[PDB]
């Protein structure tokens, strides 16, 4: 379950990472 | 404590996505 937790806040910051990439292009 | 800790940061993630979200509509 933590490990499950630890991806989902992963994932979430590579969305971010991506949003931010994006922006910038 | 730290399972609230983890749902807030999770709730904040969550925010992060639907913004994100919404900005791409």
């Known amino acids: ?3 499950d937790k630890l991806n ?3 994932k ?3 969305h ?3 949003q ?3 922006l910038k292009e």
């Open 1 to 3: 379950i933590l490990q």
């Open 12 to 14: 979430l910051v590579s």
């Open 8 to 10: 989902s806040t992963m």
């Open 20 to 22: 931010l990439n994006e």
């Open 16 to 18: 971010l990472t991506a």
